[PDB]
């Protein structure tokens, strides 16, 4: 269940931080800035030689950590990547982000991934019409994902609206500050929206 707890303890575990807890985990510390490097007793002993496979494994962890999910469903949908054709890992990253929770995230609706899951699961976020629960709900090229009727009347909703402006959308996430909506479009990739994890490594490790 999304680990739950010392979250940006992984902000340091992977090595380099991530937009995780939101405002703070991006403020003068994702718990980083102050002292970024893996926790634990051995916190800073003298970094050993990560076996090649383990660099790979740590990448897998890395990616699924930023994406905010257990690696079970993650496994299944990586298989779905193998099946649904395309240069596997690319259209994988795509059909990973196409998931509704972080669609809601980068659409600038939720400040952080966890917060996103809450909002979406409570049907605060509607999708092209009906208030879809399920944080795991892939959309399609054209669908307009909005919020709830009681959301224009909600608070940190307007926080998100006002404090976000001056920030451009993931070139397919066509929002609305005018009505609190958001169209879905084309499939993004490694470069449409980038992140600090080498995909090839991830896939090679995974399917072994």
């Amino acid at each position: 269940g999304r680990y739950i707890g010392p979250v940006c303890r992984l902000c340091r575990r992977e090595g380099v931080k991530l937009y995780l807890k939101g405002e703070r985990c991006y403020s003068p510390k994702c718990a980083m800035e102050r002292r970024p490097y893996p926790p634990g007793q051995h916190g800073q002993k003298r970094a050993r030689r990560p076996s090649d496979y383990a660099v790979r494994l740590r990448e897998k962890q890395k990616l699924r950590r930023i994406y905010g999910i257990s690696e079970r469903q993650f496994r299944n949908l990586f298989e779905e990547a193998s099946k649904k054709k395309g240069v596997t890992g690319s259209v994988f990253l795509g059909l990973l982000e196409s998931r509704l929770d972080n669609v809601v995230y980068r659409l600038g609706f939720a400040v952080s991934r966890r917060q996103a899951r809450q909002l979406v699961r409570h049907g605060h976020i509607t999708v092209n019409g009906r208030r879809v629960d399920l944080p795991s709900y892939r959309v399609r090229p054209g669908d307009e994902i909005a919020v709830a009727e009681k959301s224009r009347n909600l608070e940190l909703i307007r926080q998100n609206l006002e404090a976000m402006k001056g920030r451009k959308v993931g070139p397919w996430l066509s929002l609305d500050v005018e009505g609190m909506k958001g169209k879905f479009l084309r499939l993004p990739d490694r470069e449409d929206l980038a992140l600090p994890v080498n995909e090839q490594l991830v896939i090679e490790f995974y399917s072994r």
């Binding site: 090649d52 240069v87 596997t88 690319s90 090839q200 896939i203 090679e204």
Partner: protein
């Protein structure tokens, strides 16, 4: 500017009335990310000697590869004694899917997507050599012309 991946060291030794004097070898693969590669097996008393030296035997003994579209042209079977490296180029979405020796040598090369197996003796030394000749023996349409044009 290449990249200096190692891939095992050897803690050799010989005996004598005088104890047992060890030694070290340094299997080392140096490849330029995308273009060429080179293998070097160090061989000195104390380890790092043999490691740096190995980097240099590798850097002297190079060889490049028809690294086109991220892969290799045709596919080959190479054998070294009882060690056989099995190589087939791969359409994208594959990876350097291979052992340790191979992914070492070929990521140092620049091989992005590669279907590869390895039959017979899996002895890392001979295996590494075998990979090096997999590179050494790669032909293309152009190469084909050289021979198959006619002189």
């Amino acid at each position: 500017d290449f990249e200096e991946k190692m891939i095992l060291i050897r803690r050799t030794a010989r005996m004598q009335a005088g104890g047992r004097r060890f030694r070290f070898g340094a299997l080392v693969v140096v490849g330029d990310r995308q273009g060429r590669v080179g293998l070097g097996f160090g061989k000195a008393p104390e380890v790092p000697l043999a490691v740096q030296k190995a980097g240099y035997y590798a850097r002297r003994n190079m060889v490049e590869v028809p690294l086109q579209n991220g892969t290799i042209p045709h596919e080959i079977e190479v054998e070294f004694g009882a060690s056989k490296i099995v190589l087939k180029p791969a359409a994208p979405g594959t990876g350097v899917i291979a052992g340790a020796v191979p992914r070492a040598i070929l990521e140092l090369a620049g091989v992005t997507d590669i279907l590869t197996k390895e039959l017979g003796s899996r002895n890392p030394i001979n295996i590494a050599y075998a990979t090096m000749e997999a590179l050494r023996q790669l032909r293309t349409k152009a190469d084909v012309e050289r021979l198959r044009k006619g002189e």
